[PDB]
Amino acid sequence: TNVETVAVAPTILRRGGDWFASFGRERNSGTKLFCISGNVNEPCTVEEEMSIPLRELLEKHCGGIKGGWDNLLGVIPGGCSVPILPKNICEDVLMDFDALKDVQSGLGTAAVIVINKQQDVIRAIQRFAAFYKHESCGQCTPCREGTTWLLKAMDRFRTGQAKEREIDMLYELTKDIEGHTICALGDAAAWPIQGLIRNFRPEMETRMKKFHDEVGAVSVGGWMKDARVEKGKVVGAPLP
Amino acid sequence: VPAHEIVSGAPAELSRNRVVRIYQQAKPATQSGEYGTFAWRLDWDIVDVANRWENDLIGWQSSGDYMQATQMKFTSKESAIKFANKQGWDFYIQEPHHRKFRVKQYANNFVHSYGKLKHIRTK
Amino acid sequence: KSIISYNGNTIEIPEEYTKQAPNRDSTWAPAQASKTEIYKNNMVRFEQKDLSKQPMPYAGIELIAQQPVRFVHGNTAVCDGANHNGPGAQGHPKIFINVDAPGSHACQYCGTRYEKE
Amino acid sequence: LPGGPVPVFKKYTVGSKGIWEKLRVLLAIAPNRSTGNPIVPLYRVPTPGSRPEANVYQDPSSYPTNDIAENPYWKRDHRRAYPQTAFFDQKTVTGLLELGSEATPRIADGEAGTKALANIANGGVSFTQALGKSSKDVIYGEVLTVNGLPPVAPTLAPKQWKIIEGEAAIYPKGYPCRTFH
Amino acid sequence: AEIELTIDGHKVSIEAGSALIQACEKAGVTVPRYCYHDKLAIAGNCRMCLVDVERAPKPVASCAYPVAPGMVVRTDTERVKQARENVMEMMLQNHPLDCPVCDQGGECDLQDQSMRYGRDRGRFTEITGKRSTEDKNIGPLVKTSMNRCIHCTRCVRFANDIAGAPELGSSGRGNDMQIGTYLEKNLNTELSGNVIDLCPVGALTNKPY
Ligand SMILES: Cc1cc2nc3c(=O)[nH]c(=O)nc-3n(C[C@H](O)[C@H](O)[C@H](O)COP(=O)(O)O)c2cc1C
Ligand code: SF4
Ligand code: SF4
Ligand code: SF4
Ligand code: FES
Ligand SMILES: [Zn+2]
């Protein structure tokens, strides 16, 4: 068990169980350390009650968002391993287990990494997929062979060498890793890609059409048709 | 047992000199499949002069034995025996060998060492 | 070139015909059957015959050794062995060679050696 | 008359030119007849090893099969979805006559219906005994047609013929062969 | 002393505490696999023997899920066929195009299970492509070509347990895991030509043959 949940143990043994149970909701009860980071004006870590609205988390104790409330592109409650909340519904949201898993997402450890609008989300999620490829232990075949393919598709989608169906395909191969592994690193690596495809699909297709008439058109797998294999290397493509 | 070897058209040489073998095919050590290990094969023992020799010319495997490529499949062991002595053939029969059932647990891999460890698992 | 004809007879062939090919004299397999072996075995039927119009088609083990070694800067070297003037899929299947050990690693379909630099 | 006689300048055959064609329309049986020899600049140019269409060719495909992401193969496999031969002995037909059918279950007493199944599975009843035991409207319902007639030997797609006899026929009247369509 | 359960409608009795794969082998039900073997320990690496089990949210690995009473097991679920195609496509992404030069042509477990359970086509067509593994000289008896390894741990489990030669192992993380002696150390044991019938792919194979 975690370092926090036994560091809280003598306090709640002393104060009693129902003084702890007063805070939060019916099954979501008590306190939590919140570490709010990313693109806040004031990054800091709080100790605050569960079941709390995210707007009066980010504005009450964090200064505000860098650029105000309309400068919110998205938000990650918890660590790397839960999907994005887009801006539309994360005004209404509570930070317990209940009001995040009905928003298809997790509390996790309640790290809150908010996303600047002037920053790119697909660069961030390419970085997340590179984290999961580096940190995978490599034992079972779907996680180990999946994180490498997730990285190879996310670099390609970051610059944009793709067809508009391959995002579709990307969803499919996160569904492949999702529940077939030993530990939960496989569905940890599945989830941020799923949140990206659910919440920022036109964000990806804008970058893809930007590629499509800055450069010529592209086949499946990132191949262009001047792209050929000469001695050693691959030429013709800028190889993401 | 009716003797059909005189009405088959086969020569007398085959029923009086050639010994044949009924066997169930072994599970290969190569792969984990077991599909070719159910039918009973009928197969002729080789003749030592007539089996195979290499050609003068190119080195083709030449043969004078003609039952070397024939092989039969039967559903049953008693099917193969009934057909084999119905045709009047000298046969040997080979009994199959299945695997001994041993109980496996995944929790066997990490049980507690009281004395010397005497092993280090890997996984 | 005189070879003994199983009887103490020595039969005589020109030495341009005891070579495996006009590239290489010696044999490139442990069961390749030397030309002295072949001619020792059946010269009953190379009689009255021209050795000139026999095929002699140019052993490839030394035609691959005189090709230069390609140099790759990355970790893995890609190979298909295709031409790129031909409209279609020619060459072998595309395989990826690791170049990490000292020396040159050859393609197992084509034999073109690749080296990391 | 949609496939009737066409003149010989729509037939792709070398024919004739000059006043020799004016001679051969008088010296002919039917003037709209080719000579047999194909037109050299038209027939097989360019030669098949020299085609501009060969360098643009790509392998064809249908959409719900070449589709990269949504189909799995087990949904569009049909070699492993073969049906087997429904082999029926006489005692399963006795079972179908006496116990019933899955459309038509004449079985109450499910606990006792298993042992009512059992003796026919052992061979308690025989088949002509089942034909005598069974009702007349089960004989006219499941064995026979609902009108009491024998069922006719079934065909998959019936073919109704229509003899063409006018001048749309292939031989005019007087020839001993007819068009049947 | 025994437990009765149901696989595919079949009712089967097996000794208590066994593996679900042993229940499936007893009932005649064919379940595909890559890192299970009768004379070896149980590992859940290859993820091929996933199976539909009532009172379980996810498909469970049939080689390490123990036998319990009242068990209802299905193998012909649409979810199970989808899972087998998924795990097969995952296996095939980094496995090199060596079938005309591999020694296990008509004897490859991966290959015969790829027809029966795997996907028709392949979507692996990146420019960056498959990884490549360095060849590892083990000894004079075992030819070793480790691009076509699937990391089934089976050689490592064997030379650990039975041969008593602990020189084999798995060194690395992610795709940079390798199966060999880390120092380029020669492998002795009195039965070292037995690891080459054991590997399901042709990565460890026969050197004079
Ligand atoms: C890849 C992976 C990494 C994990 N890392 C941590 C961690 O760093 N700290 C932690 O407290 N739990 C971590 N967990 C969850 C642990 O399994 C955790 O110890 C356990 O599931 C729950 O312990 P608890 O009862 O305190 O919640 C991780 C899980 C996975 C699958
Ligand atoms: S999911 Fe975890 S245990 Fe399985 S291969 Fe990935 S890192 Fe290893
Ligand atoms: S082991 Fe792999 S490369 Fe070799 S034949 Fe089998 S599938 Fe092909
Ligand atoms: S060396 Fe062979 S048996 Fe061992 S893990 Fe690799 S592929 Fe499997
Ligand atoms: S054999 Fe059961 S998962 Fe590898
Ligand atoms: Zn090559």
Task: For D145-172, give the DSSP string.
Answer: -TTSPPPP---SS------B-STTSSS-
The answer to whether C76 and C104 are in contact (CB under 8 A) is no
For residue B29, give the chain E residue with the closest CA: E197
CB-based contacts of E110, cutoff 8 Å, min separation 6: E34, E91, E95, E150, E200, E201
Contact A233 C74 (CB under 8 A): yes
For residue D75, give the chain E residue with the closest CA: E78
CA E44 to chain centre: 9
Ligand with the closest atom to the CA of E146 = 4
A71 annotated to a ligand binding site: no
Pairing of strands A74-77, A85-86: antiparallel
Bridge partner list, C96: C78
* C80 CA to centre of ligand 6 in angstroms: 5
Task: Tell me A90's DSSP state.
Answer: T
Ligand with the closest atom to the CA of A186 = 2
Count of the separate structural domains present in chain E? 1
Q: Is E208 inside a domain boundary? A: no
The whole-angstrom separation of Cα C110 and Cα C95 is: 11
CB-based contacts of A17, cutoff 8 Å, min separation 6: none
Atom of ligand 4 nearest to the CA of E151: 5
Chain C nearest-CA distance from D54, in A, is 8
CB atoms inside a 10 Å sphere around CB D14: 13
The whole-angstrom separation of Cα D173 and Cα D165 is: 8
For residue B122, give the chain E residue with the closest CA: E157
Indicate the burial class of C66 (C-beta count within 10 angstroms; 0-12, 13-18, 19 or more).
exposed
The pair of three-digit structure tokens given for residue B117, joined into one six-digit string:
């460890």
Q: Report the half-sphere exposure of E195 (CA within 13 A, side-chain side).
A: 32
Number of H helices, E strands in chain E: 4, 9
Amino acid letter, E117: Y
Ligand with the closest atom to the CA of A184 = 1
Count of the separate structural domains present in chain B? 1
Closest CA to C24 of C53, C54, C52, C66: C66
Would the CB of E83 count as within 6 Å of ligand 5? no
Would the CB of A6 count as within 6 Å of ligand 1? no
Helix (H, G, I), strand (E, B) or coil at C32: coil
The whole-angstrom separation of Cα A135 and Cα A81 is: 13
Task: Tell me E109's DSSP state.
Answer: H
* φ, ψ at E78 (rounded to 5°): -55, -35
Tell me the residues of C at the D interface, defined by beta carbons under 8 Å apart.
Answer: 87
Contacts of A227 in chain E (CB under 8 A): 127
- Per the listing, tokens 């005692």 go with D91
For chain A, say whether D68 makes contact (Cβ under 8 Å): yes
Residue to substitute in A81, A133, A139 for testing ligand 2 pocket (most ligand atoms within 8 angstroms of CB): A139
CB atoms inside a 10 Å sphere around CB A36: 23
The answer to whether A32 and A48 are in contact (CB under 8 A) is yes
A80 annotated to a ligand binding site: no
The whole-angstrom separation of Cα A142 and Cα B21 is: 47
From the list E26, E42, E108, the residue facing B109 with the nearest CB is E42
Enclosing domain of residue D145: 62-181
For residue C117, give the chain A residue with the closest CA: A232
For chain A, say whether D53 makes contact (Cβ under 8 Å): no
Amino acid letter, E78: E
A140 annotated to a ligand binding site: yes
Nearest CA to ligand 1 atom 1: A185
The answer to whether A64 and A75 are in contact (CB under 8 A) is no
Q: Is E204 inside a domain boundary? A: no
The pair of three-digit structure tokens given for residue A221, joined into one six-digit string:
């797998």
b/e sequence C28-37, b meaning 16+ C-beta within 10 Å? eeeeeeebee
b/e sequence D42-69, b meaning 16+ C-beta within 10 Å? eeeeeeeeeeeeeeeeeeeeeeeeeeee
Evaluated on CA atoms D26, D29, D30, D33, the torsion sign reads negative
Would the CB of E149 count as within 6 Å of ligand 4? yes
Q: Subunits touching D (CB < 8 Å, at least 3 pairs)? A: A, C, E
* B84 CA to centre of ligand 1 in angstroms: 67
Residue to substitute in E20, E22, E30, E34 for testing ligand 5 pocket (most ligand atoms within 8 angstroms of CB): E34
Pairing of strands E178-179, B53-54: unpaired
Q: Report the half-sphere exposure of A126 (CA within 13 A, side-chain side).
A: 15
For chain A, say whether D86 makes contact (Cβ under 8 Å): no
Closest CA to E174 of E94, E111, E118, E113: E94
Q: Which long-range contacts (CB under 8 A, 24 or more apart) does E49-57 make?
A: E49/E21, E50/A180, E50/E80, E50/E83, E50/E84, E50/E87, E51/E20, E51/E24, E51/E75, E51/E80, E52/E77, E52/E79, E52/E80, E53/E20
For chain A, say whether C68 makes contact (Cβ under 8 Å): no
The whole-angstrom separation of Cα A122 and Cα D48 is: 50
Chain A nearest-CA distance from E75, in A, is 16
Evaluated on CA atoms C33, C34, C36, C39, the torsion sign reads positive
Task: Tell me E147's DSSP state.
Answer: G
Pairing of strands B90-93, B19-24: parallel
Amino acid letter, A179: G
CB atoms inside a 10 Å sphere around CB A128: 23
Task: Tell me B100's DSSP state.
Answer: P
The whole-angstrom separation of Cα B24 and Cα D151 is: 49
Helix (H, G, I), strand (E, B) or coil at D6: coil
The answer to whether E150 and E198 are in contact (CB under 8 A) is no
A2 annotated to a ligand binding site: yes
Helix (H, G, I), strand (E, B) or coil at E23: helix
Phi-psi region of A184 (alpha: psi -120 to 50; beta: other; left: phi over 0): alpha
The pair of three-digit structure tokens given for residue A46, joined into one six-digit string:
């709080």
Atom of ligand 3 nearest to the CA of E105: 5
Tell me the residues of B at the E interface, defined by beta carbons under 8 Å apart.
Answer: 28-33, 99, 101-109, 119-123
**What Å resolution does this PDB entry report?**
3.0
The pair of three-digit structure tokens given for residue E167, joined into one six-digit string:
């020189």
Q: What angle do CA C43, C46, C49 make, to 5 degrees?
A: 160
b/e sequence A200-233, b meaning 16+ C-beta within 10 Å? beeebeebbeebbeeeeebeebbbbeebebeebe
Enclosing domain of residue B110: 1-123
Enclosing domain of residue E37: 1-189
Ligand with the closest atom to the CA of E153 = 4
Contacts of A231 in chain C (CB under 8 A): 70, 112
E34 annotated to a ligand binding site: no
Contacts of C94 in chain E (CB under 8 A): 97, 129
Evaluated on CA atoms B108, B111, B117, B122, the torsion sign reads positive
Q: Is E100 inside a domain boundary? A: yes
Q: Subunits touching C (CB < 8 Å, at least 3 pairs)? A: A, D, E
Contacts of D57 in chain C (CB under 8 A): 87
Tell me the residues of E at the B interface, defined by beta carbons under 8 Å apart.
Answer: 15-19, 22, 26, 33, 37-38, 41-44, 63-64, 66, 104, 107-109, 112, 153, 156-157, 160-161, 166, 169-170, 197, 200
